[PDB]
Write a protein that binds this ligand. Structure first.
Ligand SMILES: *[C@@H]1O[C@H](CO[C@@H]2O[C@@H](C)[C@@H](O)[C@@H](O)[C@@H]2O)[C@@H](O[C@@H]2O[C@H](CO)[C@@H](O[C@@H]3O[C@H](CO)[C@@H](O)[C@H](O[C@H]4O[C@H](CO)[C@@H](O)[C@H](O)[C@@H]4O)[C@@H]3O)[C@H](O)[C@H]2NC(C)=O)[C@H](O)[C@H]1NC(C)=O
Ligand code: 8J9
Ligand code: NAG
Ligand code: CL
Ligand code: CL
Ligand code: ZN
Length: 578
């Protein structure tokens, strides 16, 4: 009895490696070369992997998991009983796979065109406009044009997508697809836990919001900024206003302490996409973690092709499920933002290598937020003045109190501003999936949450037919988002624990873990667990306790909260908005 179950998981592991490796290859070939032919092969391989999933999932459901004694085999079999989309009848499976392909292709080939003029892609053209333009109407053209072209074009697919992903979820024992996504955390209290964490970050976010609102009022005019209202969503340096660091120049706390232009420094010094990934590789190995294999450098796509191919530029990391072939696909631009992205993606690669000897069913992060956090932890140290100076991208190490608050502001514009955005995306989607939001009010309810959580308003009133969520990659690509909220909380918990392991003393935000083998050992032991144990065990291995907690992020930013409160008080800001 226990014997049949052990044999079954062995057979599942062997066959899954082969099939998933074949699917990954077809998916890579489409993502890096969008054509009719690669689309057809991918859709065919979708059917092949579904046949495998159905065969083994059907067997798996004949085991009474309650009677199995070994907890690891119990855990694997329970997971294989979830067929995901392979539970759908053949006709609906074919339709679902085609919808997903059509949505991701539509997002990735959308362009915004001037009349009798040039046509702009999202990466790099519109991203660069949002990051560097300081003209209200040019920012508005890019913001509205992207939503008109990408968002509106996804709307025709989204209702049927919702119907089919929910149908598959119900066929696998869940009430809807949002329920199935939340289950990946194995935490019944998840929704309340995340709400409590969000509430703890409100002092910092509200004070940052009010300070940036005041600075935007100074630049864009009192007629365009309401000092007691939400901020127009096209003014924050980013297409989705999800990170705000590109408007640092407008909000510098201490302008008498100027910062080096890091992009021109990287360009002046001949940085390339390959250099950026080599620096990330060096940071990981400095911690005693694993180098990427030679195969990684031969097969990765680290810059946008120039030979005519259309590609999915959105950065991503790829496991080919054979323990040797790992790749990154990124349309890298030479700037500091993409250097952080490179570290993020290399953290995914590191996790793939650390758990490569587990059975494939357990080759995931402890929870999805853990997978997202590894690269970001290292990038916190990369971003310090100490490390950037060592890369020749900043002129000094910043001893002065002024430089210190400036640095904390630059970090807050990315890390704190992202908290409400990352919370709200799946608050919206969870309610779409549970039927609380219908196609009658997709967009209205999106903007209700953008207001409630982020304090943003659309610069142009939305109209029927708008589908602004469709203009954000993870929506048409059906990638869950709450992982990134979890990641941004726990990455500071990890930073704090690794800095302690490294012997750092003094303020947390001055810590740089480069070359700490003690810090690397903590990470490696946790990553090697994969998905074999409840995630609180990996949390306790890294941090010495088992909970998610905002206290580390609050500690990191404590000097900035103090500065922001004083600054906002003396200007008389009214925190929040109606
Ligand atoms: C419940 O079942 C799991 C899984 O068992 C494994 O899968 C089954 C489907 C079946 O094929 C089994 O035959 C198979 O073992 C058990 O978890 C495994 O437990 C073993 C032994 O505890 C682990 O073996 C380890 O494998 C490592 C591979 O890198 C190896 O390095 C380890 O070496 C350690 O010990 C040696 C000798 O002292 C030392 O030199 C090393 O330095 C290191 O300390 C070790 O051989 C598997 O990794 C486990 N697999 C998983 C997925 O966890 C589990 O034990 C069982 N439960 C009970 C209560 O028996
Ligand atoms: C910095 C990384 C940017 C690129 C990253 N790319 C996805 C592809 C995920 C994927 C999964 C399955 C199939 C296809 C893709 C991934 O690697 O997680 C991403 O999207 N980050 C979020 C969220 C985010 C933002 C800023 C950060 O510092 C970290 C995270 C965002 O930019 O909104
Ligand atoms: C792109 O895909 C087509 C169709 O499969 C193929 O013939 C071509 O070789 C591919 N191009 C590259 C550069 O891989
Ligand atoms: Cl939007
Ligand atoms: Cl998730
Ligand atoms: Zn990621």
């Amino acid at each position: 009895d226990e014997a049949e179950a052990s044999k079954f998981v062995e057979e599942y592991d062997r066959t899954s490696q082969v099939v998933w490796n074949e699917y990954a290859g077809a998916n890579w070939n489409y993502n890096t070369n969008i054509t009719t032919e690669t689309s057809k092969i991918l859709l065919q391989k979708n059917m092949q992997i579904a046949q495998h999933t159905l065969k083994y999932g059907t067997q798996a459901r004949k085991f009474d998991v309650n009677q199995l004694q070994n907890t690891t085999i119990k855990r694997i079999i329970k997971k294989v009983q979830d067929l995901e989309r392979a539970a759908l009848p053949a006709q609906e499976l074919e339709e679902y796979n085609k919808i997903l392909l059509d949505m991701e292709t539509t997002y990735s080939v959308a362009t915004v065109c001037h009349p009798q003029g040039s046509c702009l892609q999202l990466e790099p053209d519109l991203t660069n406009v949002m990051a560097t333009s300081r003209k209200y109407e040019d920012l508005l053209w890019a913001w509205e044009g992207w939503r008109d072209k990408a968002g509106r074009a996804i709307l025709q697919f989204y209702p049927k997508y919702v119907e089919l992903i929910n149908q598959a979820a119900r066929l696998n024992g869940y009430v809807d697809a949002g329920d199935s996504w939340r289950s990946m955390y194995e935490t019944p209290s998840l929704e309340q836990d995340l709400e409590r964490l969000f509430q703890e970050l409100q002092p910092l976010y509200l004070n940052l919001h009010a300070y940036v609102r005041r600075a935007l009022h100074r630049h864009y005019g009192a007629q365009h900024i309401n000092l007691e209202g939400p901020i127009p969503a096209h003014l924050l340096g980013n297409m989705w206003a999800q990170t705000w660091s590109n408007i640092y120049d407008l909000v510098v706390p201490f302008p008498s302490a100027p910062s080096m232009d890091t992009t021109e420094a990287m360009l002046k010094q001949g940085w390339t996409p390959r250099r950026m990934f080599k620096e990330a590789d060096d940071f990981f190995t400095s911690l005693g973690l694993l180098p990427v294999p030679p195969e990684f450098w031969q097969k990765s796509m680290l810059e946008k092709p120039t030979d005519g191919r259309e590609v999915v530029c959105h950065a991503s990391a790829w496991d080919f499920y054979n323990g040797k072939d790992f790749r990154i696909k990124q349309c890298t631009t030479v700037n500091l933002e993409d250097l952080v992205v490179a570290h993020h993606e290399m953290g995914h690669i590191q996790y793939f290598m650390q758990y490569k000897d587990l059975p494939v069913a357990l080759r995931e992060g402890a929870n999805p937020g853990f997978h997202e956090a590894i690269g970001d932890v290292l990038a916190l140290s990369v971003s310090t003045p100490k490390h950037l100076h060592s890369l020749n991208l900043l002129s000094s190490e910043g001893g002065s109190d002024e430089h210190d608050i400036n640095f904390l502001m630059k970090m807050a514009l990315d890390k704190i501003a992202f908290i409400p955005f990352s919370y709200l995306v799946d608050q919206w989607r969870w309610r779409v999936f549970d039927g609380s939001i219908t196609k009658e009010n997709y967009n209205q309810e999106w903007w209700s949450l953008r207001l409630k959580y982020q304090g943003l308003c659309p610069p142009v009133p939305r109209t029927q037919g708008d589908f602004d969520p469709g203009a954000k990659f993870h929506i048409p690509s059906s990638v869950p988002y709450i992982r990134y909220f979890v990641s941004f909380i726990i990455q500071f918990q990890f930073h704090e624990a690794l800095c302690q392991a490294a012997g750092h003393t003094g303020p947390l935000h001055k810590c740089d873990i480069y070359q700490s083998k003690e810090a690397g050992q903590r990470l490696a032991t946790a990553m090697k667990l994969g998905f074999s144990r409840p995630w609180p065990e990996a949390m306790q291995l890294i941090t010495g306790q088992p909970q998610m907690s905002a206290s580390a992020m609050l500690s990191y930013f404590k000097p900035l909260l103090d500065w922001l409160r004083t600054e906002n008080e003396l200007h008389g800001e009214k925190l929040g908005w109606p």
